[PDB]
Each structure stands twice: as structure tokens, then as C-alpha cells.
Amino acid sequence: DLPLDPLWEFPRDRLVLGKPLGEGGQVVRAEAFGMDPARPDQASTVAVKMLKDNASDKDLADLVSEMEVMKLIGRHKNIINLLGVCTQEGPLYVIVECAAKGNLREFLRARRPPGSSEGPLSFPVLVSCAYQVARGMQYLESRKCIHRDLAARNVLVTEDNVMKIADFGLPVKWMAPEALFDRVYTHQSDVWSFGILLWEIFTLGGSPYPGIPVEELFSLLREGHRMDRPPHCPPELYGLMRECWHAAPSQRPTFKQLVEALDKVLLAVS
Numbered sequence: 001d002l003p004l005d006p007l008w009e010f011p012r013d014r015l016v017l018g019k020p021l022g023e024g025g026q027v028v029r030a031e032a033f034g035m036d037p038a039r040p041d042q043a044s045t046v047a048v049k050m051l052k053d054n055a056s057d058k059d060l061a062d063l064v065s066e067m068e069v070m071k072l073i074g075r076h077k078n079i080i081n082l083l084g085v086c087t088q089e090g091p092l093y094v095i096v097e098c099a100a101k102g103n104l105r106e107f108l109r110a111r112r113p114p115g116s117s118e119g120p121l122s123f124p125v126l127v128s129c130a131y132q133v134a135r136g137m138q139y140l141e142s143r144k145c146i147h148r149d150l151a152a153r154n155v156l157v158t159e160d161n162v163m164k165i166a167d168f169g170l171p172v173k174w175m176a177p178e179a180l181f182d183r184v185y186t187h188q189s190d191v192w193s194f195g196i197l198l199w200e201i202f203t204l205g206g207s208p209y210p211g212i213p214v215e216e217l218f219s220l221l222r223e224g225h226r227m228d229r230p231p232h233c234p235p236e237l238y239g240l241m242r243e244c245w246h247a248a249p250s251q252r253p254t255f256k257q258l259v260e261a262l263d264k265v266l267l268a269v270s
């Protein structure tokens with residue numbers, strides 16, 4: 001039973017629902033008509049979150065929360081953006097961008113060359129992915145958003161291969177020490193996760209701490225151990241991973257610094 005926000009209300013009759021992308025609440029693919037009000041006939045493919053009939057007063061407040069948080073954070077090329085909402089005379093729909101090529105883990109895994117051969121993702125394309133994620137996090141950070149669960153599974157990829165951070169408005173191998181032990185999340189804890197994300201990228205969607213069982217990880221970290229440089233990963237990049245994986249959060253680089261460092265590498269191609 002909700003207010004009508006004229007900046008975001010989109011007509012429910014202009015949103016043709018399609019194939020479900022996820023159940024668990026649910027998320028549905030949809031063709032929206034005139035998300036660009038420049039060309040109001042033009043169709044675009046979008047995603048839509050909504051509640052299932054099996055859902056409490058609480059679940060509604062969460063979806064309202066995420067919606068409202070997304071309005072407040074605002075727009076950036078490197079996050080999944082809010083596009084509109086449907087709040088009146090019918091169920092809550094939160095409408096957002098739909099990334100054509102799915103999440104970043106699966107994008108990279110489906111692009112692994114066989115064995116020692118060379119694959120379609122060049123080094124610059126991979127550093128580019130990492131830079132784009134860094135820019136998105138820098139932006140979310142500048143809007144006081146702590147992600148808490150940054151990982152390749154939570155970055156999505158557009159048709160034009162643009163990284164878009166997902167689920168920012170609401171996993172032990174991705175978590176910083178202070179988050180694991182002390183249940184403390186900060187921007188710096190997101191930085192730790194970005195390091196892990198970096199290793200994911202340069203392993204084409206590798207499973208972090210390969211071998212090591214989850215219960216034996218917390219002690220490997222305490223001893224000062226970290227993942228090894230992956231094969232073919234240059235040391236400038238490996239070094240960033242490692243700076244992200246410092247135990248003291250203040251000793252980790254900021255997202256600003258991550259963006260600059262990654263920028264240097266991309267400038268240093270040609």
C-alpha cells in the first residue's frame with residue numbers, strides 16, 4: 001500500500017513479463033516498452049524483481065528497502081541500475097537492467113581455452129573487467145554502500161562486455177578476516193573481496209583456495225598465508241591481490257587506489 005513516486009513509476013501495462021531468471025520472492029525477464037522516454041515505442045529487455053504469494057509483511061519491507069536504496073544510490077555504468085518501479089493497483093515490481101551474458105564467474109569459465117592454449121579473453125580485457133568492477137565499487141563506496149558480498153558471481157556482464165555490480169542494495173572464501181571473525185564489514189572488507197575477485201578473474205573463474213576445505217581456511221589466513229600467484233598472471237596484478245589481502249584493513253588499498261593502479265596497467269598497453 002505504497003506512495004506513487006513520479007520519478008520512478010513506470011506503467012504496468014508497458015511491461016510484458018517473460019522467462020523467469022530465478023525463484024527462491026522471484027526475478028523475471030521482461031520486455032519493457034519505452035524505458036527510454038526519448039523513443040517511447042522502443043522495447044528493451046529488463047529484469048524485474050517481485051514477491052511470491054508465499055511472502056510476509058517482512059519480505060515486502062526488504063524489497064521496498066532495496067528499491068528505495070537503489071533510488072538513493074543513483075546511476076553508474078558499472079552497477080545494475082534501477083530503471084523503474086510498479087507500485088500501484090497490483091504487486092510491487094522493481095525493474096532493473098538486464099545483463100545479456102550473465103554473471104562474471106560463468107562468463108569467464110565459459111571462455112577458458114583448452115589446457116595450455118590461448119583463449120578469447122586477452123590480458124587487457126581481463127584488467128578492463130577488474131577496472132570496471134573497481135570503478136563500480138568506488139562509486140558505490142562514494143554513496144556510502146558497503147556491498148558485503150563482492151565476487152564474480154555478483155558481477156554481471158552486458159552485451160557490450162561492461163561489468164555491472166549486482167545485489168548491492170540488500171561466502172567464506174571472499175570474506176575479510178574482520179568480517180569472518182568479528183562480523184565487522186567495511187569498505188576495506190569489500191577491498192579484501194575485490195582481491196579475491198581479482199584472483200577469480202585471472203583464473204578465469206577459479207574456485208578460491210583450491211583444495212583447502214572451508215574449515216581449514218581461517219587458520220591458513222591467521223598464519224599469514226594467501227593464494228599463490230595464478231599461472232600466467234603478471235606480478236603487478238598479483239601484487240594488488242596481495243595488497244588487498246593484508247590483514248590490517250588500513251594497510252589495504254582503497255578503491256580509489258585500485259582504480260588508479262588498474263588504470264596505469266591499462267594505460268601501459270600501447
Ligand SMILES: *CCC(=O)Nc1cccc(F)c1Nc1ncc(OCc2c(Cl)c(OC)cc(OC)c2Cl)cn1
Nearest residue numbers: 027047048049080094096097098099100102103166167
Ligand atoms: C537480460 C538477458 C538475460 O536473460 N540475462 C541473464 C541470463 C542469465 C543470468 C543472468 F544473470 C542474466 N542477467 C541478469 N540477471 C538478473 C539481473 O538483475 C537481477 C537484479 C535485480 Cl532483479 C534487482 O532487483 C532489485 C537488483 C539487482 O542488483 C542491483 C539485480 Cl542484479 C540482471 N541481469
